Design an enzyme around this catalytic site. Structure first.
Site, PDB file in Angstrom:
ATOM      1  N   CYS A 108     -30.887 -37.250 -31.878  1.00 12.93           N
ATOM      2  CA  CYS A 108     -31.940 -36.578 -31.108  1.00 12.93           C
ATOM      3  C   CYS A 108     -33.176 -36.271 -31.948  1.00 12.93           C
ATOM      4  CB  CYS A 108     -31.415 -35.283 -30.471  1.00 12.93           C
ATOM      5  SG  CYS A 108     -32.732 -34.320 -29.682  1.00 12.93           S
ATOM      6  N   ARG A 111     -35.133 -32.271 -31.989  1.00 11.52           N
ATOM      7  CA  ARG A 111     -34.392 -31.091 -32.428  1.00 11.52           C
ATOM      8  C   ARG A 111     -35.215 -29.955 -33.037  1.00 11.52           C
ATOM      9  NH1 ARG A 111     -29.875 -33.481 -36.087  1.00 11.52           N
ATOM     10  NH2 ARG A 111     -31.231 -35.343 -36.064  1.00 11.52           N
ATOM     11  N   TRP A 280     -37.558 -32.523 -22.351  1.00 11.01           N
ATOM     12  CA  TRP A 280     -38.657 -33.252 -21.730  1.00 11.01           C
ATOM     13  C   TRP A 280     -38.778 -34.646 -22.373  1.00 11.01           C
ATOM     14  CZ3 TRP A 280     -39.596 -28.411 -24.082  1.00 11.01           C
ATOM     15  CH2 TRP A 280     -40.086 -28.466 -25.391  1.00 11.01           C
ATOM     16  N   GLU A 285     -39.446 -43.487 -23.984  1.00  9.53           N
ATOM     17  CA  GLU A 285     -38.240 -43.526 -23.167  1.00  9.53           C
ATOM     18  C   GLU A 285     -38.526 -44.224 -21.840  1.00  9.53           C
ATOM     19  OE1 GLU A 285     -35.516 -39.982 -23.451  1.00  9.53           O
ATOM     20  OE2 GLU A 285     -37.340 -38.940 -24.083  1.00  9.53           O
TER      21      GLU A 285
HETATM   22  C1  HEM Z   1     -36.907 -30.921 -25.761  1.00  7.91           C
HETATM   23  C2  HEM Z   1     -37.306 -32.193 -25.859  1.00  7.91           C
HETATM   24  C3  HEM Z   1     -36.351 -33.337 -26.272  1.00  7.91           C
HETATM   25  C4  HEM Z   1     -36.792 -34.529 -26.656  1.00  7.91           C
HETATM   26  C5  HEM Z   1     -38.287 -34.921 -26.768  1.00  7.91           C
HETATM   27  C6  HEM Z   1     -35.643 -35.354 -26.966  1.00  7.91           C
HETATM   28  C7  HEM Z   1     -35.695 -36.657 -27.405  1.00  7.91           C
HETATM   29  C8  HEM Z   1     -34.602 -37.477 -27.443  1.00  7.91           C
HETATM   30  C9  HEM Z   1     -34.602 -38.921 -27.415  1.00  7.91           C
HETATM   31  C10 HEM Z   1     -35.842 -39.840 -27.316  1.00  7.91           C
HETATM   32  C11 HEM Z   1     -33.332 -39.310 -27.506  1.00  7.91           C
HETATM   33  C12 HEM Z   1     -32.838 -40.764 -27.466  1.00  7.91           C
HETATM   34  C13 HEM Z   1     -32.566 -40.916 -25.969  1.00  7.91           C
HETATM   35  C14 HEM Z   1     -32.356 -42.348 -25.597  1.00  7.91           C
HETATM   36  O1  HEM Z   1     -32.957 -43.238 -26.247  1.00  7.91           O
HETATM   37  O2  HEM Z   1     -31.593 -42.589 -24.634  1.00  7.91           O
HETATM   38  C15 HEM Z   1     -32.479 -38.136 -27.562  1.00  7.91           C
HETATM   39  C16 HEM Z   1     -31.104 -38.129 -27.664  1.00  7.91           C
HETATM   40  C17 HEM Z   1     -30.261 -37.043 -27.571  1.00  7.91           C
HETATM   41  N1  HEM Z   1     -30.646 -35.728 -27.345  1.00  7.91           N
HETATM   42 FE1  HEM Z   1     -32.597 -35.076 -27.277  1.00  7.91          FE
HETATM   43  N2  HEM Z   1     -34.489 -34.612 -26.739  1.00  7.91           N
HETATM   44  C18 HEM Z   1     -34.893 -33.360 -26.295  1.00  7.91           C
HETATM   45  C19 HEM Z   1     -34.056 -32.331 -25.926  1.00  7.91           C
HETATM   46  C20 HEM Z   1     -32.690 -32.266 -26.041  1.00  7.91           C
HETATM   47  C21 HEM Z   1     -31.826 -31.180 -25.611  1.00  7.91           C
HETATM   48  C22 HEM Z   1     -32.313 -29.890 -24.892  1.00  7.91           C
HETATM   49  C23 HEM Z   1     -30.561 -31.523 -25.923  1.00  7.91           C
HETATM   50  C24 HEM Z   1     -29.237 -30.746 -25.722  1.00  7.91           C
HETATM   51  C25 HEM Z   1     -29.168 -29.436 -25.436  1.00  7.91           C
HETATM   52  C26 HEM Z   1     -30.604 -32.828 -26.569  1.00  7.91           C
HETATM   53  C27 HEM Z   1     -29.542 -33.536 -27.071  1.00  7.91           C
HETATM   54  C28 HEM Z   1     -29.527 -34.889 -27.294  1.00  7.91           C
HETATM   55  C29 HEM Z   1     -28.328 -35.664 -27.502  1.00  7.91           C
HETATM   56  C30 HEM Z   1     -26.849 -35.202 -27.553  1.00  7.91           C
HETATM   57  C31 HEM Z   1     -28.819 -37.094 -27.699  1.00  7.91           C
HETATM   58  C32 HEM Z   1     -27.906 -38.321 -27.927  1.00  7.91           C
HETATM   59  C33 HEM Z   1     -27.915 -39.048 -26.581  1.00  7.91           C
HETATM   60  C34 HEM Z   1     -27.009 -40.246 -26.558  1.00  7.91           C
HETATM   61  O3  HEM Z   1     -26.258 -40.449 -27.543  1.00  7.91           O
HETATM   62  O4  HEM Z   1     -27.035 -40.996 -25.544  1.00  7.91           O
HETATM   63  N3  HEM Z   1     -31.906 -33.240 -26.604  1.00  7.91           N
HETATM   64  N4  HEM Z   1     -33.299 -37.038 -27.547  1.00  7.91           N
HETATM   65  N1  LIG Z   2     -35.331 -36.992 -23.482  1.00  2.87           N
HETATM   66  C1  LIG Z   2     -34.090 -36.576 -23.199  1.00  2.87           C
HETATM   67  C2  LIG Z   2     -33.729 -35.143 -23.514  1.00  2.87           C
HETATM   68  S1  LIG Z   2     -32.745 -34.471 -22.155  1.00  2.87           S
HETATM   69  N2  LIG Z   2     -33.151 -37.352 -22.643  1.00  2.87           N
HETATM   70  C3  LIG Z   2     -32.999 -38.558 -22.988  1.00  2.87           C
HETATM   71  C4  LIG Z   2     -32.387 -39.572 -22.041  1.00  2.87           C
HETATM   72  C5  LIG Z   2     -33.414 -40.038 -21.009  1.00  2.87           C
HETATM   73  C6  LIG Z   2     -33.531 -41.565 -21.003  1.00  2.87           C
HETATM   74  N3  LIG Z   2     -33.907 -42.046 -22.351  1.00  2.87           N
HETATM   75  C7  LIG Z   2     -34.559 -42.034 -20.003  1.00  2.87           C
HETATM   76  O1  LIG Z   2     -35.594 -42.568 -20.450  1.00  2.87           O
HETATM   77  O2  LIG Z   2     -34.352 -41.889 -18.774  1.00  2.87           O
END
Ligand code: HEM
Ligand SMILES: N=C(CS)NCCC[C@H](N)C(=O)O
Ligand code: HEM
Ligand SMILES: C[C@H](O)[C@H](O)[C@H]1CNc2nc(N)[nH]c(=O)c2N1
Ligand SMILES: C[C@H](O)[C@H](O)[C@H]1CNc2nc(N)[nH]c(=O)c2N1
Ligand SMILES: N=C(CS)NCCC[C@H](N)C(=O)O
Ligand SMILES: [Zn+2]
Lengths: 411, 407
Positions: A108, A111, A280, A285
């Protein structure tokens, strides 16, 4: 032991000690690295140690390690485990748990926000209708009329594995996908299997290119039930381009709130199988993956055609050109409608600052380079040049199998 | 552990059995992945030689033959006697081609079997090294129709008589620190440029000065040589659409020729083994031109494009980036100099992976290095799972000579 990471743009070198607290396994061995592989009943036997470990962490963070409240809590949990075979977390412990699972999420990039997470305790929920209500409240709170707020809703923990709460959707809001007789796909190809399930369960599909899917919710191990999110709660953004007036006529939109709903949250050995969370969007994405992946909406061709690019040879980089315009449009549209979004430059820069801060104050920051580096313009973002160490810490978010593959149907 | 890899775009699944032949370590453990880290006696020698000769004789379908056993015995006798051994020409060529085949960070490996190997093990002096290198450069350049080549200088003996090329590539541009704090030319080569000057080089102090060769034979102090300019093919960079692009004053060289790695074959160590193929466009346009620690030309270009550089969310860097890489490819193509775009190269690599999996049982690949530094997910390799592991013969990193050399 100590481990060094180097940024090759700035020569900044950081020292990792946090990895010493790593327990779980990476999937790599001395002889093979699996860094690019997507996915590389718990009894009393192992539960109390896992609990103690977490409670030690919790009490250390609150500067009460070794205190009476600490020792009493360990005692209380131990007796509750031996009596009831599980235990219940205090509210404070649950909040800490959820925030740290995010903090430890090596994939993520967002973070830097980890400590500002709104935690909704839904452990008193008993039915699918109750789940629907909790989820509507999450969506309305998180959306906040476009001024997005991070949130997680936590349903009751797993007991015997036969009474799981699950959200069958991969995200709370997602577009339907329909396989056509001629082999083409209408809507989002990533959601064809889930769509078919919904339809089988009785969903009347509009069969358009952007149909918001119904919620398919499973409480206490019972068969899942269908619910429609009130459309007034689903914020969407029509995609247009600041210079290309024909762009709007592609008929593209996207939803504002990304809410992953298929992961498992582990806190102190307890497993929370339904724990939808949301932040958000980072622009790429949507603009890079959702729109331009060959197996997704795949709009590069149609966009490039309207741009009148030389689509005959790849070395004209017509794909690269269209990709940038599409991503400009996505960011432009969200900003214009005042819906929270972050571009990949801003987000990766924030992540580096976050990462350095974590090294100083925490002794490290587990990070998965393969996932952290954005899917366009990789090396012009600072994370590309940053060495990272990937390891597993708990509390954690884990993958789990899709429920339709495991569910025992009641009928 | 007969592992599988999945392409998530196409659902193609390949089974890997080749990894079970792996020897050295990755730097990863069960507890920690180091995938993004850049740099993670007689009794030793014979097993190494045996392992290699075994592969060799298998590859020519004479495994277990008298000739196989004979060669094993012969090498064993020679090691026992001389503490080292010498490779037959056939073994040398096989080993070099296979070191390339095994280079997990190289996207261009579909071409691995076509390598021209120049045996320079009879070389004794830096003047001789210069001659061998000029010949390599001319053969490889081939008037813009580039051909892959490696030149192999004598192997390490006692480590006190190492042959080394001090340059990191045969052809690179100088870097100078300016009084006003900034840097003229290529910042990556500021230190090497210093040493050349320290050694007597007369620097034109331009933005694109071809560095001299600093060549070390038999452990002696290294010596300077100027590559004949008519041997250094360069390409002035223009844009097919923007007339002002030429004003930028950009050029690059046609021949990428890595000269600072160590080639290991059958336990033997070749410390001087410059090799060359041809460029993927992003190497120049993305990394060399747009890294902040290199030529760093993003803002000058965006300025000329009149892009809104007030906010990052306008994606002005991304727009400038694409145009630049269009220009690089355009220029090389126009001057008929071999170059490959990142789309074509990654597609051929997927094909190469398919071939290796089928005929060889695997293909070690480093995702972090294989995915291009721009437009990552619109290339097929982004969606390809890859297993990284170390096979020999191999190319390895080694320390820069100046941090080691006993003057
Ligand atoms: C607040 C703004 C946030 C942004 C900008 C962000 C950004 C991202 C992005 C770009 C990814 C890769 C997603 C993908 O390519 O499918 C990711 C993965 C992830 N995020 Fe965040 N995230 C946010 C919030 C959060 C929150 C609130 C949580 C949990 C409480 C979280 C937990 C995770 C986890 C567990 C992954 C791994 C997802 C996977 O393995 O499929 N994120 N994040
Ligand atoms: N950005 C977040 C924090 S909840 N989620 C990621 C997964 C969304 C996915 N990559 C999409 O582009 O629909
Ligand atoms: C002929 C066309 C070739 C292409 C298109 C190509 C492409 C590439 C690229 C893009 C890289 C990453 C380099 C970087 O980003 O710095 C690379 C690395 C590498 N290549 Fe190739 N290559 C070619 C030929 C060769 C040859 C002929 C050899 C050896 C005989 C070779 C061996 C290697 C090795 C060992 C690396 C890793 C370099 C390092 O770790 O710094 N390549 N290649
Ligand atoms: C094979 C490879 O691991 C896979 O395509 C990964 C690469 N990196 C990624 N990075 C992000 N953020 N999201 C992804 O889905 C992926 N997919
Ligand atoms: C820190 C990180 O490993 C480093 O920036 C790597 C990333 N991937 C790369 N990939 C290629 N092809 N070339 C490189 O120099 C790098 N650098
Ligand atoms: N393509 C090859 C085969 S020798 N080498 C890669 C290293 C060259 C470097 N990336 C550059 O952009 O100058
Ligand atoms: Zn690893």
């Amino acid at each position: 032991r100590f481990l060094k990471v180097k940024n090759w743009e700035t020569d900044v070198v950081l020292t990792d000690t946090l990895h010493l607290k790593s327990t779980l396994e990476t999937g790599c061995t001395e002889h093979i690295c699996m860094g690019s592989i997507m996915l590389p009943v718990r009894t009393k036997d192992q539960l109390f140690p896992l609990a103690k470990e977490f409670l030690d962490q919790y009490y250390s963070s609150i500067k009460r390690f070794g205190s009476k409240a600490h020792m009493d809590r360990l005692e209380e949990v131990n007796k509750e485990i031996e009596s009831t075979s599980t235990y219940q977390l205090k509210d404070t412990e649950l909040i800490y748990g959820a925030k740290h699972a995010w903090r430890n999420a090596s994939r993520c990039v967002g973070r830097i926000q980890w400590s500002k997470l709104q935690v909704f305790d839904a452990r008193d929920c008993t039915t699918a209708h109750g789940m629907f209500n909790y989820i509507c409240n999450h969506v309305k709170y998180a959306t906040n009329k476009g001024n997005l707020r991070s949130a997680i809703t936590i349903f009751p923990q797993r007991t015997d594995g036969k009474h799981d709460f699950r959200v069958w959707n991969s995200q709370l809001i997602r577009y339907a996908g329909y396989k056509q007789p001629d082999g083409s796909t209408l809507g989002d190809p990533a959601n064809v299997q889930f769509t078919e399930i919904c339809i089988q369960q009785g969903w009347k599909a509009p069969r358009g290119r952007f149909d918001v899917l119904p919620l398919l919710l499973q409480a206490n191990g019972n068969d899942p039930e269908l619910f429609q999110i009130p459309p007034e709660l689903v914020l969407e953004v029509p995609i247009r381009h600041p210079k290309f007036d024909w762009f709007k006529d592609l008929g593209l939109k996207w939803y504002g709130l990304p809410a992953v709903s298929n992961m498992l949250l582990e806190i102190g050995g307890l497993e929370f199988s339904a724990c939808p969370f949301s932040g958000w969007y980072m622009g790429t994405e949507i603009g890079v993956r959702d729109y331009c992946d060959n197996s997704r909406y795949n709009i590069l061709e149609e966009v490039a055609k309207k741009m009148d690019l030389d689509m005959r040879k790849t070395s004209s980089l017509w794909k690269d050109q269209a990709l940038v315009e599409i991503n400009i449009a996505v960011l432009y549209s969200f900003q214009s409608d005042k819906v929270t979004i972050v571009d990949h430059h801003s987000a990766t820069e924030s992540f580096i600052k976050h990462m350095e801060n974590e090294y100083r104050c925490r002794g490290g920051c587990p990070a998965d380079w393969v996932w952290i580096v954005p899917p366009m313009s990789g090396s012009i973002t600072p994370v590309f040049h940053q060495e990272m160490l990937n390891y597993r810490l708990t509390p954690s978010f884990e993958y789990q199998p899709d429920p339709w593959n495991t569910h025992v149907w009641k009928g």
